[PDB]
Amino acid sequence: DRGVNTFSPEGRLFQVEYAIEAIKLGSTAIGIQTSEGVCLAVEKRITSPLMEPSSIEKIVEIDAHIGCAMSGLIADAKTLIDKARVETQNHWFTYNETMTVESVTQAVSNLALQFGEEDADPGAMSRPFGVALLFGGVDEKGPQLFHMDPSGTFVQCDARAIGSASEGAQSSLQEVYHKSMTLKEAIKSSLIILKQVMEEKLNATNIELATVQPGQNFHMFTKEELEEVIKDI
Amino acid sequence: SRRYDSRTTIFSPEGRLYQVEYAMEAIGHAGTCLGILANDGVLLAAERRNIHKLLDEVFFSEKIYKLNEDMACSVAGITSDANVLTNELRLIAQRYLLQYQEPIPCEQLVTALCDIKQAYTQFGGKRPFGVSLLYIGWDKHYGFQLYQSDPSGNYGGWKATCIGNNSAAAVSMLKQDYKEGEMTLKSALALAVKVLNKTMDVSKLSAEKVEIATLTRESGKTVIRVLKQKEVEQLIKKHEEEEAKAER
Amino acid sequence: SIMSYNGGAVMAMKGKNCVAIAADRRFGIQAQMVTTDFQKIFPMGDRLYIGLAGLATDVQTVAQRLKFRLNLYELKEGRQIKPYTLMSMVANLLYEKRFGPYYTEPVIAGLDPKTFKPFICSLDLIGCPMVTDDFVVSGTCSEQMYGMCESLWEPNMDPEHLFETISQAMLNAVDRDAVSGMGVIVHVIEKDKITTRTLKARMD
Amino acid sequence: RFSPYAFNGGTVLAIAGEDFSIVASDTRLSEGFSIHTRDSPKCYKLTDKTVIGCSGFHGDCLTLTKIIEARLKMYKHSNNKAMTTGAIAAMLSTILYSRRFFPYYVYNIIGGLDEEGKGAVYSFDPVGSYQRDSFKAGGSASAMLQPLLDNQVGFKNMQNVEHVPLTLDRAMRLVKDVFISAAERDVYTGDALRICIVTKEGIREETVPLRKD
Amino acid sequence: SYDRAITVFSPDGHLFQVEYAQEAVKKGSTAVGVRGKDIVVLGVAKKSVAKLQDERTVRKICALDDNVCMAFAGLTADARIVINRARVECQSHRLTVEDPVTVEYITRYIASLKQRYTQSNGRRPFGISALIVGFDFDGTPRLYQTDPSGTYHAWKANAIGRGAKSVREFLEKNYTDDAIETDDLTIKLVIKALLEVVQSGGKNIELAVMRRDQPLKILNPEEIEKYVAEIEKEKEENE
Amino acid sequence: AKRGYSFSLTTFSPSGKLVQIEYALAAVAGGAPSVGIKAANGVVLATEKKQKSILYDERSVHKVEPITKHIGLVYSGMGPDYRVLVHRARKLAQQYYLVYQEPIPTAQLVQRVASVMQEYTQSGGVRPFGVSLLICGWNEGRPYLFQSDPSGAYFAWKATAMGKNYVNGKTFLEKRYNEDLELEDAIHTAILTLKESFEGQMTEDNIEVGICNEAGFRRLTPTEVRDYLAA
Amino acid sequence: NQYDNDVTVWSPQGRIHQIEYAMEAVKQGSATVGLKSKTHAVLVALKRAQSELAAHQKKILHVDNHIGISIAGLTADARLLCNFMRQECLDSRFVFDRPLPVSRLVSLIGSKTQIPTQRYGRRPYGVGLLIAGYDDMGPHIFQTCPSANYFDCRAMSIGARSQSARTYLERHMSEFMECNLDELVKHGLRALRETLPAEQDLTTKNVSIGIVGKDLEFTIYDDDDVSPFLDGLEERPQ
Amino acid sequence: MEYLIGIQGPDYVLVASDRVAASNIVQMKDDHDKMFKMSEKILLLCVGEAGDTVQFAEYIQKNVQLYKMRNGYELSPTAAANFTRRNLADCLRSRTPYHVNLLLAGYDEHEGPALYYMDYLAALAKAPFAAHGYGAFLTLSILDRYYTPTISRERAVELLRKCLEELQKRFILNLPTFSVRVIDKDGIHNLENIAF
Amino acid sequence: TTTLAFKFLHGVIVAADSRATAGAYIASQTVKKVIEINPYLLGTMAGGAADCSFWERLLARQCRIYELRNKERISVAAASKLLANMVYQYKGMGLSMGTMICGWDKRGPGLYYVDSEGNRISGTAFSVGSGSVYAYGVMDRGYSYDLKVEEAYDLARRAIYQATYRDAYSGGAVNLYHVREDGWIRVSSDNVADLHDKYSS
Ligand SMILES: *[C@@](C)(CO)[C@](*)(O)[C@H](Cc1ccccc1)NC(=O)[C@H](Cc1ccc(OC)cc1)NC(=O)[C@H](C)NC(=O)CN1CCOCC1
């Protein structure tokens, strides 16, 4: 038995590396950066037909121009998402402008290693967040996709997959993705890869899709417009 | 530092609090303490553990504590930990009277202390209070009441209950004799002497080995009265005639 | 004057083996009368009473905070409180607010448990004890009450004679004060009984 | 009793054109009936696109410009961008309001270029109230400069004038003329006039002498 | 002052303290609630009340606000804290926003509170799952549940506690528009689900109904025994 | 650089026992014998003061300490621990007097002191006191004798003995003590109870004894102890 | 084995394992090369791709106008230290109106990094830095470690397979001080090149350059800005 | 300036308040309610400072409601008045003193009708009838004149009407409408608003 | 200032001037005294220029967070309560702001008045500012719930004009907003000088 801020002989932190393993348990999520916009996809993994599928939100909006998709321990991300939402509004209040996708990713990444036992505040974290995040939005640099993990490392990705079957999904993305593909091609590609790795058959109420683009704001797909691309197998 | 921490407020692999269950074992070693609800009142009967010839007897009681004008409690477990809780109970009762200008309702006093006992099981890293309490009282909402309290912070209202040594053997004995809505204070007292006679490993039962307190509604005011030796001896001799009634 | 805002008058008197405590019944804000039956004398332990005069809030806040402490005392101790003990408790309570006090000058009247000995005292707003063998007064008509008590009070008075003295002392003093009156309640405390009487008084 | 404030004079002026923004001020620093220094330009440069002018209590003016400098570098590191004219103006509003119950005795005018490349002028009160406008004067002689600008730049009260766009030559002429006129009447204004011109090429500084009495 | 990490990550990426708290709710009394189209009803089984116990004081169904109520499973002492925290929040939402609390909001509060107790120093997770029930000022009925981890979902019908697996799969079969037609039939679905675990209830069944018109109505052992007979002549209608 | 442990060091064993308290009871049992007797006229407190080297100055440190004008103390177990409780009891006695202007009743003082002893069985990063206390006092025209042990529990005695041979002490007491013995006779039987467990022959510099009656609490002078030793 | 849990536990050999393990995190991240001349200080950093469908990690960060850093280790610890360095520089300019001397900033890092290595329940900073700065004493190259020990070096390289760079930097060391800016960067890249397998070397995707000096403030070159520096390349003579 | 009045009978409590919300010289609102529902059988009529009135009365309101949810039953009129008084008394010497003159009316299960008067200094007093505001000075004498403890509710309204008509005749401030409510065993009842 | 708002059959009208004064000196005559919180929520401002601008902007921040957290728009009653609570913490400090918060709810057309003194009242018609006593005059004389959309515009526009004619601290231009079921729209922004010529016919 040890403390939470203990280094392994290799050089990495135990609790942080174990938190990465918690993502492997969570449902798979895909994001694709495109000239025309950014799409975010996630599987819900409904365990019972009695459970309302719309109450499982794994893609949420941070601002009009920024969306976020999580995987792992959903309950942990709720504070991270709220801190992100507060930061974009605080930025607007002070600077009268929208915050950049990279800045919001960076703000959240600062909270990642804010855990500890001794020398800690009355309301301090005890463990890292067991959640990976996919930030997708549009700013001055255009449509951008950012990935985050418990280690606090954040990096821009052309396309990224995180979750249980993230290994097979990423190689599927490397096979399909190239620089010039459209957003319509991006949504189509993300869903095909999603239906391959899912244990359950991909359905309209089974998944979530959201796109942020230069044209208009964050938009989550309804049952009808989900079915519009579900019928393309 | 973390090597010396015994982790008092932690879950077990099976999903239970070890320090609470281990504390409950401490209650089972303490003196037998029971309570019975009647129609015309409510009483507590407790086994005296301070039973030495050289003891002085200065206080009105050993196990029974008066908390309020309308309320009283009895204790089973670590006696020092009880002194902390009984003192806090009196403060809570006074806080309520200061604010609302009427006596604290029985259930409200029990929950307030249980909130404290629960706290010591979830955070702080301290050991739980090794005490189970039985509460008797009257309020303008439910009348005569009897409540039980755990070291876990768990509480329950009972018509008849027992805690301490031979708790299981006593509760099944109460489960036999008790009549719902038919028990009078005289019949509940007779039951109390009977149950304590069987659970007492020294089955002679003198008045100096037991302790009985009654809570009655008397002409608009609540009367809490601890029965003295001559009253208790008289109750035992009544029960002792029932052992001589089996010769039929 | 902050003490003259609600008015009021509280008096205590020593008898043979008894004590009397009286107060006016007016509750008013400055010139306006609001209630004709306000309680200023409070029971602290059967044969012991406290009368509080001053600001109506502080009269009520002190009375309730004193009972809070007294109930805890009488439960911690196996006994009921003694008159001198209450006096020191009140003094303690009032001095805690030394630099921002309750605007009330209390008066304690009662009989000592077991010894049945009479006891009277008055205190400061910051809790200075003053024990006497004759009388203690507090209120807006302090001067009026003193003039009555000095000329009327006699050494050994039986409950009936004591009642007549405190009643007459209160009535005639109150009648020269604008912010006091509207009825006078008197408690005569004996070992075996307590006599409580409201007097026939002016209502102007 | 000790007073934490002192009136140090100084008047700041800014005019926004279509491709330029002029920020100008006198150079006199005063206290009571005496002059501290004849060389104290109130216009200070923040970025390539933005220039600020501060007047009133100099102590607060020095502190605030140092605070802005720090906050500007803070934004640069955090966002990888230079802070824009509108974003500085929005920030300055919050900084001035943070001292609401102990105000900065300060009159700020921000002049620079927006995202489209057009001229911008932002006016400020001591506690943070601000708006964008085409021309603004702030300071001791602000009540002297303003009416002439309202008449000549805004064409207000005039009947049949064409409404010709502001040229750099006319605006520069207008700054010099109002300051010469203010130096005749306001005792706090004088010595020398410094003008800062904001264009696509950057910031230029020009100095013209005034009365020194 | 006591800053010791209680809940930590395991080598395989698990939170044992959370999972152990989820074992504590498993040992608790069976709690089930179904969502109709006019009324929402929840009920609790696995009672085994000693008879000699006052059944009024051991109620596991609690009201939170004028329009929100909840049931639980697991550590009864833990729930009482949560319920009190949820009740305070219901009035605090009225002091800040004036508008009454929504069913989703109060669930989100309970969930965040339970989540905060899995990521804080010196604290241990709550060992309860809650079934939150209410009506929006909109007309639509609502049913939510929480668990020790702090995850919450909306349900048409759900069961947590002892033998939650058994009732969960009974509801999956029996939940149709025919079963939730009127008020009586939605109540029947709860009781029929409770008879899967409990040894013939009526005395061992506590259940309460909530309509959008009136507050909470807890049914007494006389009104519950009526449904015991009404479904009995449905069961004994095979011939 | 310091803070403090916030977790208890006294915990419940699987058998349901507070092990540290029972081990602290072992410490008092191994301590020097002390006896207390209520005389219904006064109270006597007597303790063994074996000095071991003669080089030790007897009068320098005392085992029988006064809390106030009417209350006195003895212990069995650890000297250093006893001394902390002495200071705490004295301070508690003054708190009461400042509020009520009345000498603190023995029962009230014992309750307050026992609460402190209770704290050290539950507070963060501390062990219980390895001391049992004998508290005597005169108030309300009545003698009092109390015992406070490591757990934080108090008992009212007519007569008791603690430390080494506490079993032999009590069995000697109930055999010899009767609730009628005057203070003078109480001192005799207090010394005799110590004599039962002494092994070394008594002198006036070998035992410490304090009395408490209506006149107040005081330690008996070496000369007085010498005159009583003429048994 | 039993002495490797806490920074407060001393090994019987007179070592602290927790500090040594934190130092391993530096050797985990990709190599970065720091070198100085007489007027300029240059940081050349290799970037890691987690999967070449994603961008290469940010390795060079700004501190002030005259100071810049290249990190090796934990990113979140790197940004935490970076914010501390920024703050101290900002305070210096706020108070004294002059840039904070590089040596004095590094001395402050030594102070801040020492604290956790002596407190229980705390951990060392899992990042080593190479600091490039210019002040009154000319260009500077400083090395920091998870242990609060720091170095004032002529040239330095830390990271994965940074051993090969150390050999190159040592042999062409006497050439550095008299060297011009154009070739001073070349020497940096030719050092960073050695820290790579013989398949492929430096490109526009994986090279980041940070230059500060008497001429210019600290500037980061990354993609299109890095391609003039790569031109005039000399193939690997392994 | 605001007005409150309360009349207690044998088994009811009649309360009324003006519906005027004014700022300096203008009447900004015509249908303002100065009555706060605490329980099903308790009303709290709050009057005084611009901000303190709403903030204080509402804080007590949600606390009584919290008590209702906490224990299953409601507070008594006696317990409610003492709870309000405690919160007001405690704040009196603090940094934020509430300047509110209030009037609490309620019906108890066992004790019956109850009316409480309260100072801004937090002086609690039980009265058969009580009034607040400048209008109290003109009306209180009419209450003293035509009041018996055995007054029926229909004649209590007549007595109330005598008071409100006096406010039209002598009182210099314009007070056209009044909110009228009665509390008894059945709860709180809305009455016809008396208008002029 | 002068600001006014009233609700009729077809929605809610919101009118304001644009004068800003610094003592007896006119600082500006182009200030936007109506704050656009949501596509359906508005807020007027009168009093301390900085105080008004800051707290209403703080409220606009607060409401967006509410919108993100609950997936629903905030109610007029809720929005108004938040501002009322925030400003109450600072009562006695010397803040000066009289504001009207108005939009469209599930309850329908809402209109609330909020003070720095701690007032919060719902009403069908309000007038706030130094020239409020003048605006009330004509707004009440020409008001009816049955007013046409263009007739309601004329009532509000003239009510500000009449206020600028009497009050020294009111002037500039009259800005008009119409809050309807779908949301609000910018109606008109006419100069007082231009209106003066039209109202003389
Ligand atoms: C009318 C025009 C005048 O009363 C309005 O109330 C108007 C409202 C408004 C709203 C936003 C933008 C512009 C205008 N108010 C003012 O113009 C206002 C008048 C005022 C001054 C001081 C007050 O006490 C705090 C209250 C009202 N003018 C200002 O606020 C001016 C621009 N600023 C100052 O006076 C400077 N500071 C000095 C420090 O204290 C705060 C004000």
Short mmCIF file of N, CA and C and ligand atoms in Angstrom, two decimals, chain D residues 100 103 125-127 129, chain I residues 1-2 17 19-23 27 31 33 45-53 94 96 130 169-170, ligand 1:
data_model
loop_
_atom_site.label_atom_id
_atom_site.label_comp_id
_atom_site.label_asym_id
_atom_site.label_seq_id
_atom_site.Cartn_x
_atom_site.Cartn_y
_atom_site.Cartn_z
N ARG D 100 -14.40 48.99 -7.50
CA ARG D 100 -15.62 49.80 -7.49
C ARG D 100 -15.77 50.64 -6.22
N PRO D 103 -12.30 53.48 -6.13
CA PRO D 103 -12.08 53.67 -7.56
C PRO D 103 -10.68 54.13 -7.95
N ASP D 125 -15.19 55.58 -18.10
CA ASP D 125 -15.32 56.35 -16.87
C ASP D 125 -14.43 55.71 -15.78
N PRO D 126 -14.27 56.36 -14.61
CA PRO D 126 -13.36 55.82 -13.59
C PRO D 126 -13.64 54.38 -13.14
N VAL D 127 -14.91 53.97 -13.15
CA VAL D 127 -15.30 52.68 -12.57
C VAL D 127 -15.64 51.58 -13.58
N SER D 129 -17.54 51.82 -16.85
CA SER D 129 -18.54 52.06 -17.89
C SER D 129 -17.88 52.49 -19.20
N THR I 1 -31.30 58.99 -16.90
CA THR I 1 -32.09 58.06 -17.76
C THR I 1 -33.59 58.34 -17.77
N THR I 2 -34.38 57.78 -18.89
CA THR I 2 -35.76 57.22 -18.83
C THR I 2 -35.88 55.88 -19.55
N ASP I 17 -34.06 55.68 -23.57
CA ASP I 17 -33.31 56.77 -24.19
C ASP I 17 -31.84 56.36 -24.36
N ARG I 19 -29.12 58.96 -23.34
CA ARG I 19 -28.30 59.97 -22.68
C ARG I 19 -27.53 59.35 -21.52
N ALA I 20 -26.27 59.73 -21.39
CA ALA I 20 -25.45 59.40 -20.23
C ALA I 20 -24.86 60.69 -19.69
N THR I 21 -25.06 60.95 -18.41
CA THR I 21 -24.57 62.19 -17.81
C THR I 21 -23.46 61.95 -16.79
N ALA I 22 -22.55 62.91 -16.70
CA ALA I 22 -21.53 62.95 -15.66
C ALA I 22 -21.68 64.27 -14.90
N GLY I 23 -22.56 64.26 -13.90
CA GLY I 23 -23.00 65.50 -13.26
C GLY I 23 -23.94 66.23 -14.21
N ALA I 27 -22.27 63.12 -21.09
CA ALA I 27 -21.14 62.29 -21.51
C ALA I 27 -21.38 61.62 -22.86
N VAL I 31 -25.76 55.60 -26.02
CA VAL I 31 -25.65 54.37 -25.23
C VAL I 31 -26.87 53.46 -25.41
N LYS I 33 -29.21 51.20 -23.81
CA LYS I 33 -29.69 50.95 -22.45
C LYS I 33 -30.53 49.68 -22.32
N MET I 45 -31.59 49.34 -18.29
CA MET I 45 -30.70 49.87 -17.26
C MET I 45 -30.84 51.38 -17.03
N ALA I 46 -30.83 51.76 -15.75
CA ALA I 46 -30.96 53.14 -15.31
C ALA I 46 -30.23 53.32 -13.98
N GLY I 47 -29.46 54.40 -13.86
CA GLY I 47 -28.69 54.67 -12.65
C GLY I 47 -27.20 54.72 -12.93
N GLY I 48 -26.41 54.15 -12.03
CA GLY I 48 -24.96 54.08 -12.20
C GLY I 48 -24.63 53.32 -13.47
N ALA I 49 -23.95 53.99 -14.40
CA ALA I 49 -23.66 53.42 -15.71
C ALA I 49 -22.80 52.16 -15.63
N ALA I 50 -21.76 52.20 -14.80
CA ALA I 50 -20.89 51.04 -14.62
C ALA I 50 -21.64 49.92 -13.90
N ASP I 51 -22.32 50.27 -12.81
CA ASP I 51 -23.08 49.30 -12.02
C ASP I 51 -24.09 48.54 -12.87
N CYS I 52 -24.86 49.26 -13.68
CA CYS I 52 -25.85 48.66 -14.56
C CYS I 52 -25.22 47.71 -15.59
N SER I 53 -24.20 48.20 -16.29
CA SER I 53 -23.54 47.44 -17.35
C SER I 53 -22.94 46.14 -16.83
N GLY I 94 -23.69 51.40 -1.77
CA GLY I 94 -23.79 52.58 -2.63
C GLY I 94 -23.93 52.31 -4.12
N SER I 96 -26.06 51.82 -7.49
CA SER I 96 -27.26 52.48 -7.96
C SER I 96 -27.71 51.90 -9.30
N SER I 130 -34.65 58.94 -14.00
CA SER I 130 -34.86 60.30 -13.50
C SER I 130 -36.09 60.95 -14.13
N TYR I 169 -31.89 65.21 -17.56
CA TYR I 169 -30.99 64.05 -17.60
C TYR I 169 -31.50 62.93 -18.49
N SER I 170 -32.31 63.31 -19.48
CA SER I 170 -32.82 62.36 -20.46
C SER I 170 -32.80 62.98 -21.85
C1 LIG J 1 -29.81 58.80 -16.86
C2 LIG J 1 -29.21 59.34 -18.19
C3 LIG J 1 -29.21 59.76 -15.79
O1 LIG J 1 -29.66 59.39 -14.48
C4 LIG J 1 -29.48 57.26 -16.62
O2 LIG J 1 -29.70 56.91 -15.24
C5 LIG J 1 -28.05 56.75 -17.00
C6 LIG J 1 -28.11 55.21 -17.28
C7 LIG J 1 -27.03 54.65 -18.19
C8 LIG J 1 -26.80 53.27 -18.24
C9 LIG J 1 -25.71 52.75 -18.96
C10 LIG J 1 -24.88 53.63 -19.71
C11 LIG J 1 -25.13 55.01 -19.70
C12 LIG J 1 -26.21 55.52 -18.97
N1 LIG J 1 -27.10 57.00 -15.91
C13 LIG J 1 -26.00 57.80 -16.01
O3 LIG J 1 -25.69 58.38 -17.04
C14 LIG J 1 -25.12 57.94 -14.77
C15 LIG J 1 -25.74 58.93 -13.73
C16 LIG J 1 -25.36 58.51 -12.32
C17 LIG J 1 -24.14 58.92 -11.75
C18 LIG J 1 -23.76 58.44 -10.49
C19 LIG J 1 -24.62 57.59 -9.76
O4 LIG J 1 -24.21 57.08 -8.52
C20 LIG J 1 -23.38 55.90 -8.52
C21 LIG J 1 -25.88 57.25 -10.29
C22 LIG J 1 -26.23 57.69 -11.58
N2 LIG J 1 -23.77 58.41 -15.13
C23 LIG J 1 -22.63 57.72 -14.87
O5 LIG J 1 -22.60 56.66 -14.26
C24 LIG J 1 -21.31 58.31 -15.32
C25 LIG J 1 -21.01 57.88 -16.78
N3 LIG J 1 -20.20 57.89 -14.45
C26 LIG J 1 -19.81 58.57 -13.35
O6 LIG J 1 -20.48 59.46 -12.83
C27 LIG J 1 -18.48 58.23 -12.70
N4 LIG J 1 -18.50 57.42 -11.44
C28 LIG J 1 -17.69 58.03 -10.35
C29 LIG J 1 -17.53 57.03 -9.18
O7 LIG J 1 -18.83 56.59 -8.72
C30 LIG J 1 -19.64 55.98 -9.74
C31 LIG J 1 -19.83 56.94 -10.95
#
